Design a protein around this ligand. Structure first.
Ligand SMILES: [Ca+2]
Length: 260
């Protein structure tokens, strides 16, 4: 069907210069299995041995290659936990870059995620987070950034979450959409939904050393049970996890472009 190279960049990016592919962080995921080429670019784990948030248990076995998609799976981990698929890049992205995934999010209460995090887990850009179950929120591209204090764990930049509907406000679970980030410099990023600009972000860094987003970030493609939800009693049921209609997040392609 579709290769990521044939899809035009947003006019806003082409107004700025020519762009080339970073092949190490781009994949059509058209492999029939997790082969040598898959493992050259990707690891079928999180960036470190964190097993994940809330009732999440990150699982190498919950990422599948099938029929031109990376499929991100979820299964009951008895008694009350959720095996969550996760892949992350071996190579880092630094500004300026355009990072975009084509995905059909799950229909589960888990978050369907395309994000970036520095090795030391300080710097986080959320290009997309969506809860697939939500009558309203399943329609919303969820964009955010976080600068974390690690030792006494604290978000130094909470409440930066902004939600955007696609044109016509469809349920995002019903079709492939593109979730894009133009990371321009240490303090600026533009977010794009289906190639259209939805957010002009300026980063506010309150750290002693306000250098902003100046580190290499690793790509993460995952699904997660978020603790604030499962603590409110919002978490997939057994029948939901088994419902082949809603239990899978599909990634047709991911791409990362650099100036030429
Ligand atoms: Ca594909």
């Amino acid at each position: 069907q579709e290769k990521y190279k044939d899809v035009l960049l947003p006019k806003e990016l082409t107004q700025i210069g020519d762009w080339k592919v970073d092949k190490n962080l781009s994949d059509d995921f058209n492999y029939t299995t997790k082969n040598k080429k898959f493992f050259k670019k990707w690891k079928d784990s999180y960036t470190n041995d964190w097993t994940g948030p809330g009732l999440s248990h990150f699982s190498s076995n919950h990422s599948i290659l099938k029929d031109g998609n990376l499929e991100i799976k979820a299964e009951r981990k008895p008694p009350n936990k959720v095996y969550c698929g996760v892949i992350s890049s071996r190579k880092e992205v630094i500004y300026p870059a355009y990072m975009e995934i084509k995905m059909k999010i799950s229909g589960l209460k888990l978050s369907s995620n395309f994000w970036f995090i520095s090795k030391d887990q300080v710097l986080e850009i959320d290009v997309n987070e969506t809860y697939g179950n939500e009558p309203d929120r399943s329609k919303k591209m969820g964009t955010n950034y976080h600068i974390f204090q690690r030792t006494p764990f604290k978000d130094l930049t909470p409440n930066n979450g902004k939600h955007y509907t696609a044109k016509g406000a469809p349920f995002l679970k019903d079709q492939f959409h593109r979730f894009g980030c133009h990371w321009k410099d240490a303090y600026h990023a533009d977010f794009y939904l289906d190639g259209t600009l939805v957010r002009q972000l300026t980063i506010e860094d309150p750290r002693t050393s306000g250098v902003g987003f100046n580190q290499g970030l690793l790509m993460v493609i995952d699904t997660e049970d978020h603790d604030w939800r499962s603590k409110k009693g919002i978490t997939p049921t057994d029948d939901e996890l088994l419902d082949e209609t809603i239990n899978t997040m599909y990634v047709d392609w991911v791409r990362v472009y650099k100036p030429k």
